[PDB]
Design an enzyme around this catalytic site. Structure first.
Site, PDB file in Angstrom:
ATOM      1  N   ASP A   1       0.837  -1.196   0.000  1.00 56.31           N
ATOM      2  CA  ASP A   1       0.000   0.000   0.000  1.00 56.31           C
ATOM      3  C   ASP A   1       0.871   1.243   0.000  1.00 56.31           C
ATOM      4  O   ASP A   1       1.381   1.650   1.046  1.00 56.31           O
ATOM      5  CB  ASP A   1      -0.875  -0.023   1.249  1.00 56.31           C
ATOM      6  CG  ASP A   1      -1.796   1.188   1.306  1.00 56.31           C
ATOM      7  OD1 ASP A   1      -1.912   1.888   0.302  1.00 56.31           O
ATOM      8  OD2 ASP A   1      -2.395   1.382   2.406  1.00 56.31           O
TER       9      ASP A   1
ATOM     10  N   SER B   1      -0.811  15.743 -11.780  1.00 54.59           N
ATOM     11  CA  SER B   1      -1.069  15.414 -13.175  1.00 54.59           C
ATOM     12  C   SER B   1      -1.310  16.683 -13.967  1.00 54.59           C
ATOM     13  O   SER B   1      -1.868  17.652 -13.432  1.00 54.59           O
ATOM     14  CB  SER B   1      -2.277  14.458 -13.266  1.00 54.59           C
ATOM     15  OG  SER B   1      -2.705  14.248 -14.539  1.00 54.59           O
TER      16      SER B   1
END
Length: 330
Positions: free
Chosen positions: A35, A199
């Site tokens: 994770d 992004s």
């Protein structure tokens, strides 16, 4: 040193991935959920409340010649999905894919929430976010990556998750055979303890690319892609009959649909998520309403590039003094 381990979807939807991990001496192999959005290595154990164990493999420290109680240390964690676990701490030898760390904090669960009990395939979590998020008290502990780092050939790990197929976690090297083209690296903020990046924008299907900054985290422990409501609405508007269902808890779509792809930007590069990656199947067994793999982050407080996004790429988690993320097509 290096390590290389195969990671395998737990079910036909790629809800999560499990990776075998050797703990203790002789080795006890547990299948852990790696994770990148958390920083605790915790396991089902001989200490876990018996009614909360249903099919998991447990770690038994008393059977490990190298286990040592980390006296006084406790841990307690709550995840974004509402799940939780807590317990005490041992140090022991942990190996992943041939890479060994001695003295790793292995957090032994005394209690786990119902979602963990109900998932027989996951024996615990191995956190790969920054060690500043580790929950051990009163002495915070390091992740497996942070403890391995100085021994690695390069201070990196890579995630290469499969779509309905096994993939690979590598430690200490970048497999140049595992991706196509070049890797685009992007800056990381560690301020919240995550692999947080920005992004450069998105496109829906064959549509034009929208240049827009989307800050979010690279999180292997989250199944879906959670993005701003504007972006998500623009995606699902291209699917006839898709709608946000407050009763189901997100966007659903007719199972008869063909989904468009979703592209996200990494600098000037583009990662394309095929439409089939966004199908999470019937909302309940036999339903003709299907659950979407792109969902709004509005009720989270962060955007999350979970497995839906990451499995479309070869992802480099660069843990050099200045961390960075890299993405390549594959």
């Amino acid at each position: 040193s290096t390590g290389s381990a195969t990671t395998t979807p737990i079910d036909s939807l790629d809800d999560a991935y499990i990776t075998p991990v050797q703990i203790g001496t002789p080795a006890q192999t547990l299948n852990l959920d790696f994770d990148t959005g958390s920083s605790d290595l915790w396991v089902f154990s001989s200490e876990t409340t018996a009614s909360e164990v249903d099919g998991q493999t447990i770690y038994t420290p008393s059977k490990s010649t190298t286990a040592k109680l980390l006296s006084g240390a406790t841990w307690s964690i709550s995840y974004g999905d509402g799940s939780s676990s807590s317990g005490d701490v041992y140090t022991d030898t942990v190996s992943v894919g041939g890479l060994t760390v001695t003295g790793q904090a292995v957090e032994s669960a005394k209690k786990v929430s119902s979602s963990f009990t109900e998932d027989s395939t996951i024996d615990g979590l191995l956190g790969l976010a920054f060690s500043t998020l580790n929950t051990v008290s009163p002495t915070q502990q390091k992740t497996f990556f942070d403890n391995a780092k100085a021994s690695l050939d390069s201070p990196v790990f890579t995630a290469d998750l499969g779509y309905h197929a096994p993939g690979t976690y590598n430690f200490g090297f970048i497999d140049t055979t595992a991706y196509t083209g070049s890797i685009t690296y992007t800056a990381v903020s560690t301020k919240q303890g995550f692999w947080e990046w920005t992004s450069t924008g998105y496109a829906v299907g064959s549509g034009t690319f929208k240049s827009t900054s989307i800050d979010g985290i690279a999180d292997t422990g989250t199944t879906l892609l959670y993005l701003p409501a504007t972006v998500v609405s623009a995606y699902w508007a291209q699917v006839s009959g898709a709608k946000s269902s407050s009763s189901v808890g997100g966007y659903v779509f007719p199972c008869s649909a063909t989904l468009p792809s979703f592209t996200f930007g990494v600098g000037s590069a583009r990662i394309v998520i095929p439409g089939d990656y966004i199908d999470f199947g019937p909302i309940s067994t036999g339903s003709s309403s299907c659950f979407g793999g792109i969902q709004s982050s509005a009720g989270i407080g962060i955007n999350i590039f979970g497995d839906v996004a990451l499995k479309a790429a070869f992802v480099v988690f660069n843990g050099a003094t200045t961390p960075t993320l890299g993405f390549a097509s594959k």
